């Protein structure tokens, strides 16, 4: 039996999101068939949510900060009522507040420009172990170490992450991310960990990680904004009134039909 | 029934401790006997360890700076070898290590005695809420760091309802705050167990002395100094990447005790 899906692909910031539509959310097949639309022999993308309405099912019901941009930006794209700015009321798994996205126009009627209030930092810290200096901010869900790069001395990206293994052995984590961080350039490449899946992932972009960034700069060079370059795209962290906002790139791709096999 | 065994009692830097000598250090009992010898109806102390040939065994088997510093102080005592100075090399529960501690003369029963202290994991500094807390992470406890006057106005117990909400997600078997004093250098150490569910405001802690110390070479470029404490003192001092503590320690009383 072959199933028929609507989806929409997009590149919020360069985390390809597919957004299936007109779909259950509840159904237990959702992983297993986000799983095989992310495969590179498929509709390839990093993440995959699920719509309705004005809520986003995400594949793993956490919380995305991108694919809520994405999602907020496919509204604006089929909102006929939509001219160059709205502000669209969203709801997404993992998040209990209604998160209010303003959505700009980038120019074409497929670019956009989504701005959304990401989660705020349970805590702050400097960690100094081994030989490296290194930043964390503790969030319900991630925690998220920072490497500067230059202020450290020469190492593997492997062994900095072999490093903040060991130190959460005695610590209950589902999931941690490591920003390697380059102060010459405002760059950053985002990894994550996931225990379950005993594996690591550089990925493309990263609401969250950018946040992190954010705060950790915040401290460390007292930077309310900024852009940080990733490795394809790029978003930008924004404190206002003791909030962090994530601002970032989003591209409507493709739409359509996709078929998988049951 | 009723036990007799043969004690000293010791004033290692306020912490203090009973040593129960000539007795089985591998008894199961040790346990139950260490809880009656430490209260206030009874002996009192806050740390008991038994001995055999320069060997220390703690009621818990962990490491313990101060009762370490109150054996070496001991065979000093013991030893009319002794003068103003010999290193008298001990052993301790929790540690492989042997430990060459530098005992000298303060009276007859009062000592000083200087011993390694075990290194950190990690040091760092948290910034949960509106606090800074420094953090050392040693092996098997986390030494938090109030230092008091850079923070703002604060009770005590906020900050422990605080920390533990911080090591909710994390394993662990007990964890220690150190308010700190900047101006006197003087620091209240506070130690919390959840495996025994309480919180004791300590007289003194050789760990903790170590955590400060670790904590003031980072900041302040600090190797060594004098934290006074509740009612004792300890020094820490930081040489060739090595962490000591030394203080003084005064033999208290010699004889028997009853336990039933």
């Given amino acids: 039996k072959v199933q028929v899906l609507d989806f929409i692909k997009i590149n919020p910031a360069g985390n390809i999101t597919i957004l299936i539509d007109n779909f259950d959310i509840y159904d237990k097949n959702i992983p297993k068939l986000s799983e095989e639309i992310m495969k590179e022999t498929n509709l390839y993308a990093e993440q995959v949510g699920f719509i309705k309405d ?28 939509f001219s160059k700015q709205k502000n669209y009321n969203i709801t997404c798994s993992g998040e209990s507040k209604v ?5 700009r126009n980038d120019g074409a009627k497929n670019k956009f420009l989504a701005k959304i209030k990401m989660p705020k930092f349970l805590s702050l810290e400097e960690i100094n172990v081994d030989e490296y200096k290194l930043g964390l901010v503790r969030f319900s869900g991630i925690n998220h170490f920072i490497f500067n790069i230059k202020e450290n001395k020469e190492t593997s990206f492997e062994n900095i992450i072999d490093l903040v293994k060991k130190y959460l ?17 405002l760059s950053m490449k985002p990894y994550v960990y996931v225990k379950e899946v005993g594996s690591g992932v550089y990925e493309n972009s990263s609401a969250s990680g950018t946040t992190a960034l954010g705060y950790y700069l915040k401290k460390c060079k007292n930077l309310d ?38």
């Avoid at 986003?56 to 994405?70: I, T, V």
């Avoid at 998160?99 to 959505?103: E, G, R």
């Avoid at 052995?169 to 350039?185: C, K, R, T, V």
């Avoid at 003791?242 to 039909?257: L, R, S, T, W």
């Fill in 54 to 81: 004005s809520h986003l099912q995400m594949m793993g019901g956490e919380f995305c900060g991108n694919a809520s941009r994405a999602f907020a930006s496919l509204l604006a794209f089929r909102d006929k009522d």
């Fill in 225 to 262: 904004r900024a852009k940080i370059v990733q490795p394809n795209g790029w978003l930008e962290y924004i404190i206002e009134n003791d909030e962090m906002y994530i601002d970032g790139p989003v591209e409507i791709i493709a739409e359509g039909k996709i078929y998988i096999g049951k």
């Fill in 169 to 185: 052995s005695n610590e209950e984590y589902s999931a941690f991310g490591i920003m390697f961080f380059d102060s010459d350039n």
């Fill in 99 to 103: 998160l209010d996205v303003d959505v």
